[PDB]
Symmetry: D2
């Protein structure tokens, strides 16, 4: 298999797209930007319904970290299908969900005692985090960051702050969430270069919380938790300053506020550590994961300090949680991660950094490149001084990449994420970065952007 695209979308793809629009809700599908109609997957390739072959740099939005169709994950699922599928893990018991809980407790950040709540999704894992934090603290308010994405349910919509259309006509959602700026080193209310001056940006965000919220309208003692992504995903793959979370933990500990680390997109080895927060040297009270954990089977998990447990039965539960097929898949994923795929993320990190910095020196349309392991963001701007979003150009680059056999996703208002499966070879990665660069070159030339 190699990148190989003729007409896209081809005739079979256009039929599926039309039927999708007829039968399915209007969501985030884009027939104009994301006309990829997947029939099968093999290693790091999609094969579309018209037989187009595309190298994958999206991992299906950071889910297929272990490969699009990993054989160790498939064999574990098949073995589990021969035994049992659903055992009602929240009314009855089974050993499968317990084996996964023990492993998640073992791989959690830091050396503190943990327990686990299993669910079906990242939004469920984050709703469970809200409940655990309210029950255990008996406090009801939360702080979250502008640009954050935590899910689309009534509790998590209040945490989420990436695009206002996510909230359209939904007010009221769960009351009690206040938002402050993320320490985004490229874009922040202070105009601070957070790469050159990380401490000044860290200090402005901490001071915003302490001086602007705590000293005026948010009683610090009534805040149950601070929700954060360790790198903002949907908000643009924004990597905050290395010392930010240590300072945030000082502020949280002073007031008895929990730290809730959303790893739904950046966990399961994406950043060359099991948990992205491992790069920032703090131990969060709660960690949420989903997506990649199940290697293609829906699963969520909420990993928490053991003393935060619900003190009485019946406060929280679900039906499908501890699904035995998801559990089997997840144990296989974690084994693949610990035995080679995380090391692969570490090995390819310098290739991404080197190639994306080379691209930033050459192509004026690139405002910023940022990343860790195999999580990279490239943000496009109309002018490097104004940092005006190049939204149209960003969309055109995604389309020019797809026409050349590379599947990319947008993030934020004018960025692209590069998140190839962790099984990707050095050669496959170079092939993708080459296609990406050709897409940037074409859209630059079209619009008269400087090429140096």
């Amino acid at each position: 298999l190699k990148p190989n695209v003729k007409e896209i979308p081809g005739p079979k793809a256009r039929k599926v797209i039309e039927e999708h629009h007829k039968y399915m809700a209007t969501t985030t599908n884009d027939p104009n930007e994301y006309f990829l109609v997947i029939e099968r997957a093999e290693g790091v390739y999609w094969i579309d319904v018209d037989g187009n072959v595309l190298l994958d740099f999206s991992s299906g939005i950071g889910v297929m970290n272990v490969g699009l169709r990993n054989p160790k994950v498939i064999e574990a699922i098949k073995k589990q299908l021969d035994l049992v599928l659903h055992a009602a893990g929240t009314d009855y018991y089974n050993p499968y969900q317990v084996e996964l809980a023990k492993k998640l407790v073992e791989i959690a950040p830091g050396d503190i005692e943990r327990k686990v709540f299993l669910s079906n999704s990242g939004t469920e894992a984050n709703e469970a985090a809200l409940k655990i934090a309210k029950w255990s603290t008996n406090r009801k308010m939360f702080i979250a960051f502008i640009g954050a994405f935590h899910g689309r349910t009534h509790g998590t919509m209040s945490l989420t702050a990436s695009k206002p259309v996510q909230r359209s006509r939904m007010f009221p959602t769960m009351p009690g969430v206040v938002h402050v700026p993320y320490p985004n080193p490229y874009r922040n209310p202070w105009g601070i270069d957070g790469y050159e001056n990380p401490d000044e940006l860290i200090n402005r965000v901490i001071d915003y919380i302490e001086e602007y919220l705590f000293e005026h309208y948010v009683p610090a003692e009534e805040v149950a938790g601070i929700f954060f992504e360790p790198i903002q995903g949907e908000g643009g793959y924004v990597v905050p300053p290395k010392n930010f979370f240590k300072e945030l933990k000082k502020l949280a500990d002073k007031h008895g506020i929990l730290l809730i680390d959303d790893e739904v997109q950046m966990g399961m080895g994406r950043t060359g550590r099991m948990w992205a927060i491992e790069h920032f040297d703090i131990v969060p009270d709660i960690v949420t994961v989903a997506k990649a954990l199940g290697g293609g089977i829906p699963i969520g998990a909420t990993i928490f300090r053991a003393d935060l447990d619900f003190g009485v039965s019946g406060v929280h539960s679900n039906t499908f949680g501890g699904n035995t097929v998801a559990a089997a898949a997840a144990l296989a994923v974690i084994e693949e991660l610990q035995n080679g795929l995380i090391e692969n993320a570490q090995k390819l990190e310098p290739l991404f950094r080197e190639r994306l910095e080379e691209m930033k020196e050459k192509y004026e349309i690139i405002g910023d490149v940022r990343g860790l392991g195999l999580a990279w963001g490239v943000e496009f701007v109309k002018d490097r001084k104004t940092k005006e979003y190049a939204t149209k150009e960003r969309g055109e680059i995604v389309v020019e990449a797809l026409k050349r056999g590379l599947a990319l996703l947008g993030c934020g208002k004018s960025a692209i994420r590069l998140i190839p499966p962790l099984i990707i070879s050095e050669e496959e990665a170079k092939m993708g970065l080459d296609i990406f660069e050709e897409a940037i070159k074409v859209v630059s030339e079209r619009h008269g952007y400087k090429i140096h």
Copy 2:
């Protein structure tokens, strides 16, 4: 396989219960009443880790309608694993999710224009229903029923009204839900026998909404939707009067309010119709489904009147929704239902009615029996005039059933649900009803309850 239980919980069972308590969150697991530790499943039998064989009357909380390990569902899953598992359903397209959407549109109650939103669970499907209703009506309030169960997320916790421990320290959840009594023919605020006098009970519930809420404190024009279960599940397998939903639809239509039918537990053929609402002769605006739809794989669906669609992209979505493994499982489940299992539930209905009415005549501890198809509730009371809940005895009946090779689940404060897989044979059904009867007889003898 036949029912065959020695020591339960056995040594291997005791060790998994101990480990589950150590690593997992406190949810609804009961070491004293639900010590069933499942290792595998065959036909309608659970095989525990100690080799105990139990006839299943639980369907794993109404998920395993097509059987505990259905070969056609498993074949569809293994075939889909050879193609692709996750294809980012909401960013990219795939024909598997569209084929499920087309089938769900077709099988929806009534014959009106429908679209479908796919998710990962019942609570997600109900959260999607709230969002669709708010967006489409531009109204924010909802009416739900006392005794309701709709899920445990911030939106659905406001709808749910079954046990207050479900809400412990969770306030505030989503604002704008008002609750009114369900037309529970055995227990209601008017003391109406709603079996003998269904119309009186219907009129009291409708009059409570119209006179008590609309004429005083709930502006009818600001209500987006009335959420209901066509039979209350977690609240006790409570079957409302046949004409109730026709009267509720007349009220809703007068004020432009949506009817939202939660079929998460009672749908997918459980009542001898594809949808339980079919017994009530109305066409709901929104239908929510999960559990049995995925035949053991996590899936949810929200089927809605097509003109309610979200006008704009990005108001709702998810990562896992449209999961191709869950879509293949669901198409296989629906084919199994339509090719004999729904007819089997209709055929077995009169056996359940006859045997449970015989048990009510004989065992004074039985206050009420009720059901449709293969959904039955038996409620236990200390006295038939006071209807004081026999909660202790209810748990003992479940325990004795287990000791005799029958897996049962409690519902409400003192009821048991009988929900065997729809593939159960007449002989397997008679065997489980005989075991149920022995468990009632044993606990009646033990406590001095009359046996007539």
Copy 3:
């Protein structure tokens, strides 16, 4: 002065109504039913701008309990104007507000430790009650009664449940209020005659809270307070069963819930006791008062169990609270009440009961009469079996009373309140009851209602 009305509204009255519509907000003013345009007041008489003289049975919505222009109140005001008007009650100190606080502590129902918070209105006094209850219990939910009226601010609009137009487009107000039926002996969801069967109605209301709310969706331990009117005012002058509050206090005490008695309309001697709650033999934790307390000057008070006090400075306050003019007026009002006016309301009670029961025997249009002291409600129905509201006829009776020199106010959907100043003589009371009776007779004749 005697009742003496020619053309009403006269020319000067019509011009003020026109100007009011031009410059003022649309509130509850009625040009067709309440065309009384007051220029001055003397004793128990209103003198309109056209020189029409009307006997007052309105007390200006229960504010003018001590008379429309009480000389002792006016002398206290003029004396205070020679000293100081406003002294910033909550930043600086002044002896006038403290002397009122000491008197309110003394006259509070029962003999427990009390403190007082002073404000400017009923709605402010009830908002203060919510804050005191939330702070002191650290609980956030409240129970209120259908038909309640507690004010029109964001906190009190959640408590109020009288007319839905009070809440039109206001959602969301303060979250956490749940409503249950009032023990209205004439109209309740059980169809109980609560005059003949008070205990049955009490038990249905208590059982609705305990079984329907506490056992299903309202955690009893999270409820700060139950708000009630001892007689519902705006909701129809509805007098509950004598033993109701004793039963409500037993329920509240079992769960550590505060009882909050709203005396804004029924206090300051209106029922022939200083507080209406005195007829029910309980001691509320919080009592709210306004209206008659200031004898025509804006004032509110929240009298509370002293250990509920705010622990820290700055949780609540206001600018105008403790206003020295309002404090002088209030001390004068209380002295007038204690020196004969409360005794006068007790003396006139049997005259009102006798004459209204005679009117009920004679005029079929009267569905119900009810009252205590000088607080009476008369509810008009189209038919005594259906109890359909006679809303049109109710308004016509008010209009005909006005044409004959009696000022009346509607309450609820089809009732009239009789609330004459407490200084009214037996002869003035007989005169107003005779006019009321003629207005009922005229509107009965006009519409063909039976007269027995």
Copy 4:
């Protein structure tokens, strides 16, 4: 009369303070900082219960703009007491409330058609503004500013953002308020000198709303209104840049958002214009006033664009609104304001500016002086570079002033407000500024602050 203080608090004052603490709620009284116990008032002097005579620079928190005991206001009240006090302005009509509404409409900012809602307080006037804005726009969200004070009721507590103790244990209040930084030229998150660089500060605040709220988590189309003080009162007498409100109005008009101008503290001539907003050249949709309007009698008013009126009766009302005694007082206040007191504010403005800038040059403890007309703020800091709040020193200066016969109030964390009655003479004003300067000198010398 002249400043004349012996012992303060003296023996009569200490008795009142002790009784206040025994009988009254814990609010914002300070026996340590504000031991002023007022017995009477004469011109611009308080006379305390021990006969101490103090020049007033507090106007009783900006209420006594027309003098502590104005004879024209007292004569109008007395004349009204001879006619009627309360006429139930929201059920019946009277000419007195209508005369005040017409005048308020005439003196409103700009030349647009207005209507008026009368209430009893500033918090009531602002709750009415919330209701008018929700009803008329059918939108439910609001923006307010950090440092803002709009009142302590459930709706206005959500708008208020000055001290967190104001909200302690009150969550949830009315949902839907988001807060952004005020363009405070001395203290802001950007470190901008808003005196030297006003446009840069204006632009940061506008960009915070547009880029940080509108482009991320607040749908601009769902915002009913932006609440602002034209000068923040309780937050420190912060005067924003002259062009800020013009830019805010551009943003509001683009999105159909109302501008709500809270003049409760800065209106009724305080700033040398009837309305403080008149200095900033915009016409707000709604203006709220209270305090000073009634010259010592409780009153509130909400003045709004006439097309925002409630389209149906019964949405909003009160009992005491249109109180005839308050209305008489208010017309007298406005006549005094238009015929000499506003001109006096204009005449004394340069004296305050000159004396306070002289004090800032001499006393290093002064960080900032700011003001308009007879509204002045002086902020004290421990160091002019850190701007660390000198809270203790600020309290000591208030006490040293009181000991020398000047009544001052604190504002913000370390500021003092100078708000003498608008009748103050040039000589009286110089006497006050001299005492203030002596208090600053004493506290400077005590703590070793530089005197230049």
